[PDB]
Amino acid sequence: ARARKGALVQCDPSIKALILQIDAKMSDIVLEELDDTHLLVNPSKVEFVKHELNRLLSKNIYNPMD
Amino acid sequence: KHSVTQYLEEIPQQVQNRLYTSPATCLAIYRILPPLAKFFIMAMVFNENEVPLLDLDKWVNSNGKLQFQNAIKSMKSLHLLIPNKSSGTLMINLNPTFKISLRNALTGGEVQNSFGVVVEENVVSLDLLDEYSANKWETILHFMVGTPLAKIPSEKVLNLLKHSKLMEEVNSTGEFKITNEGFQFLLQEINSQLWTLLLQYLKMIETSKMDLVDVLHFIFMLGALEVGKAYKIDALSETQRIMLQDMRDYGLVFQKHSNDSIFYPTKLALMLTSDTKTIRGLKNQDIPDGSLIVETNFKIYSYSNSPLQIAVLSLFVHLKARFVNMVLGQITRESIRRALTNGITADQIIAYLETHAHPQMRRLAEEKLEKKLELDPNCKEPLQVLPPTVVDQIRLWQLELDRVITYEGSLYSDFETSQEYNLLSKYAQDIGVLLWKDDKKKKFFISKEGNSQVLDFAKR
Amino acid sequence: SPSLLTVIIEIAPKLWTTFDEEGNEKGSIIKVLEALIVFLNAHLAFNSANKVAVIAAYSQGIKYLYPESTSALXXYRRFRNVDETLVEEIYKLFELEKKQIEQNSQRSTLAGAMSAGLTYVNRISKESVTTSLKSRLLVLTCGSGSSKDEIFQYIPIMNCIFSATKMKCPIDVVKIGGSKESTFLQQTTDATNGVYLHVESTEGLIQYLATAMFIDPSLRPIIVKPNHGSVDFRTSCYLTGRVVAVGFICSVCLCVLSIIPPGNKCPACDSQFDEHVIAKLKRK
Amino acid sequence: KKRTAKKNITPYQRGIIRSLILTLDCSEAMLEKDLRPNRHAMIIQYAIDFVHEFFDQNPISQMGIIIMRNGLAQLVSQVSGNPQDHIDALKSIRKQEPKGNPSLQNALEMARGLLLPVPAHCTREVLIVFGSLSTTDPGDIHQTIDSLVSEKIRVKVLGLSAQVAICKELCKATNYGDESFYKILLDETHLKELFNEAVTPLPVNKINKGFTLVKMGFPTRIFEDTPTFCSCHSKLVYGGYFCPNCHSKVCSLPTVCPCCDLMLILSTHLARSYHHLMPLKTFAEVPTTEKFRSEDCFSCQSRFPXXXXXXXXXXXXXSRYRCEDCKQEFCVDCDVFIHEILHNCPGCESK
Ligand SMILES: [Zn+2]
Ligand SMILES: [Zn+2]
Ligand SMILES: [Zn+2]
Ligand SMILES: [Zn+2]
Ligand SMILES: [Zn+2]
User: Fold this and answer.
1) Using CB atoms, which residue from B405, B411, B412 is nearest to A11?
2) Quick one: which of C101, C255, D65, D114 has the most CB atoms within 10 Å?
3) Ligand closest in space to the Cα of D253
4) D342/C119 touch (CB, cutoff 8 Å), yes or no
């Protein structure tokens, strides 16, 4: 029973489609994807993509709420 | 929860064997075991004969055997046992180093760790060394997260906590704030704070002059009970006594004056080991000395207000004036985002609010709870327990901070027979481990629970 | 959820003498006592401060031993004191041993003893309303002589069960002596969903203790090890003393008899019974 | 300042083998907001409790349920020894709602013929839950009153916080002309005790009647599980019993045999009546000063009994409930619970 596991993150591909090249920008530690709703990462380095996940989302948005 | 027990098993065999040497250490770790591991291990302590798993596989009746599968993975983790892949079965026997190590202590053992402390006149009073020790914990508790007065002198702890970054404060600016760990530190009621502290003491003081096993005897010397007389005098290693001095320094050891006397058994050391009643200048009213307002009305209304106790509450709600009775404020879905301003989700707050300020919400939480458990099969209308309207008020407050979804598990494939899948389909519905699945793919990202229950139904 | 193990142990010196009489005097229930105490310490050591109680029933009275009602007014340092305090009780009860102690052999205060502790347990359960303990008790019998099967106390024994079943508590019992397999205990422990075993006297039973008495408190996830069958063909014809299987109740008196009764005034209540009903019964 | 019966005239014939079919009202009257959900829903909550307890305290009895809706009475449960069929019935009845008005006489006669197959030893009795102030009778009630008393069936009923004279007369008429059976409620706990006192058998003074002996046998449990096979329900039973006479594999049931039709009972039900049959006298609260007994409880260890000349704290009372027969004390918590659960006076048990 051999398992081709990985740091699975399930979501829509929308911001993931961003993340794809963005990963290639951030050195792309999201490794494997059997199907589009999935993303597998490197355990020593899972969160660095999720770092700018906040950073890109908060850089200028800043909640003006006029 | 980092689940220090997981760290406990995390240590390798030989250091476990190094810790297996002391019956007192062997004794204390026993209480961590589940009743499965508790009772069953006791059996092999006496009958000196390795038992193949097939007997134990046969021992457990219907549902409850998963705990055995939980147990076997657990015991392997700390290697308390010795699995033997001898005859195709699993010929299991104890690790007598611990097994016979505690076995002596079972019938009046010679475990010097158990006898290191000297039973003497434990003159430590109720308030004396407890009011100070609790005041020490309270004083550092205010100082650590940031209170009106930061009287905590644990610079090494501050260096360790700041170095560990658990207290999310700007050490460069001298900030001592509750970060994700620090705010999470608010989650740890009594032991949890001490656990991360114990981990912090372990993580901080673990490399240089470790002597941890010797310290562990001192640790479990503190963990065992109040030292009484001759504790610091006799039962104290270089690391153990220094750690005991370090433990005594943090108030967790209520050592006598002049720092040189028999062990002063303060309540603090036992309580983290206890998981029980967490009760601690000359006036102290409790528990209701500190209280706040939180109910379905979604408002703060205090009639007691303890500055350190209320300091916790104000971090997620605007405060107007700390009355003699009241901490004047109103909770808003934006107000809870002040915690989210730090990034602290009001998720620990869910239990915490039902836990903290209850001294002023005894009636309200009880009117919320209403003992609506036996009537649940009969009456299907709960009374805001736990408040879902607040949860709704809470849940959409998080709408400001959105866009996160992920799940834990493992990739599962190479599945062919649908009968068993259909069999497991209801059986998984019978065992309820389903995060999500799909017959269209026969694939899921969940734990290893389903296989083992299928493993041990009728196999051997 | 901790447990409250309340040992209800009979203390009959004749039974202790029988314990010496059966087999040899190669070690009395003191050896059994030796096994108990260390095994007893395992209970508290098992769960998070799972409390206990100890009561013993002599021929002319009973008394708590561990509970230690106000009288004055190692092993974690708790077992040392608790057992030693208990140790004094038995030796105090050793002083409570003379011809007057040996006199009231007609009386049997064990019947009250089994019931009495439960109230105290319930009283303990009452005060321990918070943090309810999944408790279970233990009872021990040194197989004695001069009484093959005491029956006067059996009637209250039945009453305890209904309360005990209502009290929701299993009980372990072991008979130690002559192989008089007490159906009462066989039924009762089965009725209370416990265990009955008739072990021998001089064997070292701590393994028996630690194994056979490590089951009930809260878990019961394991295959049970019951004794032989628990048939419920109930008490003998009170008039005859021989077991009846086709029940024959006299009247509201409920007297348990065989086909014996004369159709009037059973030997448990002065109630003449309807001859026409008897004649209808006699139609067979 | 004590609320106790002066003496308990139990000593003899009571209602033990019972055939009670309690009748409820399912009308607009039960719909009103007198109790927190309403009368009926809280009553259904209240009524559910007694069922098992009735079968608990009186497993030797049989019981069905009848309701009254829209000026008509409706049976809703079969007279049986199993709570569950009765229990599961109320769940639907809980989800069912009372409607219209009750028909007393419809319940009067439906229950009347219902109790006809009841044997003489099984004691016939009926209890009523009524909320309205008027009935719906297709005929002369006094005739039915006459019919019922001719059937020698005493009856206790409990209306709401009010009185109906004929119902006061009916409980009188049913009960040998003795009116002690139209007690009504004034509070939910005062209603709760009504359940609590209802489970008790009914001795007052039974007229010297034909008293019948009973013959039966005990059942013998089946052991095999894989051999699953049933006869009383034509099912597969993974464990059962055996009739003493017909010797049929019968599921766990203290009821009557289904083949040769004999009662199957082991021991438990029997002694339930026994403590009911011959209860004890209440543990007399020994005086604060005139007792001067051991400063502790007897059944339990309650060292505190008073307060020792503490102004009024000691002048209050002395928790010294002492059983007279044993001449031994008991703490009130112990003593009350003793008389509550297990008579079994250890002082009287020890001799
Ligand atoms: Zn009789
Ligand atoms: Zn059946
Ligand atoms: Zn039959
Ligand atoms: Zn008492
Ligand atoms: Zn008495």
Assistant:
1) B405
2) D65
3) 2
4) yes
Q: Which long-range contacts (CB under 8 A, 24 or more apart) does C90-99 make?
A: C90/C33, C90/C56, C90/C65, C93/C11, C93/C56, C93/C58, C93/C63, C93/C65, C96/C58, C97/C13
Strand partners, B51: B92
**Hey, is C204 helix, strand or coil?**
coil
Output the CA torsion sign for B237, B238, B240, B242.
positive
| Sequence-ordered strand ranges (E) for D52-204 | 62-69, 72-80, 123-125
Ligand with smallest separation from the Cα of D304: 4
Q: Name every residue whose Cβ is closer than 8 Å to that of residue D289 and which is 6 or more positions away in sequence.
A: none
Residues of B with CB under 8 A from a CB of C: 27, 30-31, 35-36, 38-39, 42-43, 46-47, 58-61, 64-65, 67, 105-108, 114-115, 119, 224-225, 275-276
Q: What does residue B224 show for φ and ψ, rounded to 5 degrees?
A: -65, -65
Please name the method used to determine this structure.
Answer: cryo-EM
Q: Helix, strand or coil for residue D221?
A: strand
Distance D251 CA to ligand 2 centre (A): 5
Q: Angle at the Cα of D54 (from D49 to D60), degrees rounded to 5?
A: 155
Neighbours of chain A (3+ CB pairs under 8 A): B
Tell me which of C58, C122, C150, C155 to substitute to probe the interface with D (most D C-beta atoms closer than 10 Å).
C122
Place of tokens 């019974």: C273
Residues in C closer than 8 angstroms to D346, CB to CB, are 62, 112-113, 115-116, 119
Substitution target from B62, B367, B379 for chain D, most D beta carbons within 10 A = B379
Domain boundaries, chain A: 1-66
Return the HEC string of chain B: CCCHHHHHHHCCHHHHHHHHCCHHHHHHHHCCCCHHHHHHHHHHHHCCCCEEHHHHHHHECCCCHHHHHHHHHHHHHHCCEECCCCCCCCEEEECHHHHHHHHHHHCCCCCHHHHCCECCCCCCCCCCCCHHHHHHHHHHHHHHHCCCCCCCCCHHHHHHHHHHCCCCCCCCCCCCCCCHHHHHHHHCCCHHHHHHHHHHHHHHCCCCCCCHHHHHHHHHHHHHCCCEECCCCCCCCHHHHHHHHHHHHCCCCCCCHHHCCCECCCHHHHHHHHCCCCCCCCCCCCCCCCCCCCCCCCCCCCCCCCHHHHHHHHHHCEEEEECCCCEEEECCCCCCHHHHHCCCCCCHHHHHHHHCCHHHCHHHHHHHHCCCCCCCCCCCCCCCCCCHHHHHHHHHHHHHCCCCCCCCCEECCCCCCHHHHHHHHHHHHHHCCCCCCCCCCCCCEECCHHHHHHHCCCCC
Q: Three-state SS for D158?
A: strand
**C-alpha–C-alpha distance, residues B35 and B14, integer Å:** 26
List phi, psi (to 5°) of C116.
-65, -40
- Token output for A30: 């999201």
**What Å resolution does this PDB entry report?**
4.0
- Tell me how far the alpha carbon of residue D263 lies from the centroid of ligand 3, in angstroms: 8
Residues across chain C:
284
The answer to whether A8 contacts B411, with C-beta atoms less than 8 Å apart, is: yes
